[model samples]
Target chain A: GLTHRKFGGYGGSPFSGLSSIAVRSGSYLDAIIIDGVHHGGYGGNLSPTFTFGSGEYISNMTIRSGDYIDNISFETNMGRRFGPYGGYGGSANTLSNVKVIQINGSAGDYLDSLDIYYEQY
Target chain B: GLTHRKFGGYGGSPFSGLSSIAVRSGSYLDAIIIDGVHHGGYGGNLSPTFTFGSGEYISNMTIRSGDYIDNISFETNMGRRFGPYGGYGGSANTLSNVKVIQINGSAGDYLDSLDIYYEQY
Candidate 1:
C-alpha cells in the first residue's frame, strides 16, 4: 500500500491543473509504482510534474497522456533507484501520446536495466 | 521493430559484463522499450549500465537483477522521453533485491506520469 500526496501550487509557482499523487517526501518508499492515464498534465506549464526526495526507491512506472496534455516529467534529488519490469525501459512500462522529461539532480541515481516491447513517444 | 545494441568498454572505461540492447543513436524511435531482467549488471563495476543519446524516444521499460549482482543504471542525453505502464514507477514495474539508478544529463528528459504500486531498494 502507498500514501497519495497531491500536487499543488507552492511559492507562487503556477502549478495548478497539474495535480497528481505519490508517496510523501522524506518517506522511505520501496518499489514505488505509478499509473498516469487520467490524472496528469493538461497543457498547463507544470501540468504533469513529479518531484520526490531522498527517502524514495521507485521500481515500476507507467505514463500516458490524456487528451488535453502532451508533456510530463520526473524530478528527484540524491540517492534514488528506479527499476521497471519487463525490461529496462520495456514495453510493459509504456509511454504514449506525450513528451516525457526526467530530471536527476543527485549523484547516486539509478535507472536499472529492462526489456522493451512497444512505445510511441 | 527495434534493433539490439551491445554495450562494451569504451575509452578505457571499466564497462564489461554489462551488455544490453536498444535503438541506434542519432535515430528517433517511437515507443522505445527495454527489458533488463537478464543480461544486465553482474557486479563488474560498470556491470549493468544503459546509455542513450538524443533523437531517441522511449515509451516502456522493465529492469531487474540476476543472482550474482547488484547496482544498475540508465543514462541519456537531451530530448528523450520515457513512459512506463501500470503506474509511473508502479508495482507492475517491479524492482526487487537490487540497487537501481537513473541519470539524465540533457535538458528535456521526460519521465512521464504513472501509478506506482510496490518496490524494495
Candidate 2:
C-alpha cells in the first residue's frame, strides 16, 4: 500500500527515483525543483543539485512544518542523507523505510504545502 | 525538555549518549546490550557492537513493536545510520532531530518494552 501526508496546499509536479531535486533554503523553504520541474517563488538560496544513482532510493524522510515548510531531509539506501534544508522551526514528521516516489504541493514566496508519496519495498 | 515513547514493559537500567549497543535479531528482538550491560533473554543472533565517538549523538531513531519488539535503527549526527535490526514487521515509532540520551526497557525471550529518552540539541 502507498500513503502520503500533505501539508499546506497542493501544486507542483510528481517526481520519483529517477529525478533531480534542488531546494531553495531560506528562513522558509523558498522554492524547489523536482524532476527538473520548478515550484515556488524565488526568495531563498538555491542548493546544489541532488540526483540519485542506480539502486539508490529514499529509505527515510523527515519534514518539519507549521505555518510553512520549515525543514526537509531525505536519507537514501546508499547511506547518504540530504538536506535538513529550510528554517529551524516546526515539529518533526518523519517517515522511515519507505521510498518516496512523488511530490506535489503549494508554493509562493515560500513553500506553503507539500505532498510526499511513499511506498514500502 | 526530554521525551520518549515506551513500548513493551519497563525494567532495564537507564543509558544514554555515552553507551554502546548490540541487538539480538530474531523473530523478535531476542536481547540487547547497552554500555556493555545486557538485557532480554537468550535467543537469536547477536549483532556487532556499536559505539559512538565524542559529541556523536543520535538524531534519528525508529522502533517497531507489537507483542514484542520487532525492529530498531538509529541515525547519528556523525552521518551514520545503524540497525533496523530485528524482524521486519510492525508499524514504526520514529523520532527525528532529537538527541536520544537515555534507554531503559523490559526484557524476556524477546524485548518486551523500551523507553528511549531524548532531548533537543
Return the TM-score for each candidate structure: 0.17, 0.43
Q: What DockQ does each listed candidate score?
A: 0.02, 0.01
| Interface RMSD for all numbered candidates | 18.2, 22.1
Question: Can you write out model 1's per-residue Cα lDDT over B5-115, one digit (the tens) per residue?
Answer: 111111111111111223211111111112221211122121222333212222233422121111112322233333221112212233333212221111011112221
Chain B, TM-score, each prediction? 0.19, 0.82
Return the top candidate by TM-score: 2
Output the number of the DockQ-best candidate: 1
- Residue pairs with clashing backbones, model 2: A11-A105, B8-B112, B8-B113, B9-B113
Give residue A103's lDDT in candidate 2 (0 to 100): 51
Candidate 1 chain A has its poorest 10 consecutive residues by lDDT at: A103-112
**Model 1 Cα lDDT, one tens digit per residue, A1-121:** 2111211111111111111223211111111122221111122121222433223322233422221111112322233323211112212223333222221110011111212121123
What's the residue-level lDDT of A72 in candidate 1? 19
State each model's CA lDDT, in order: 0.21, 0.63
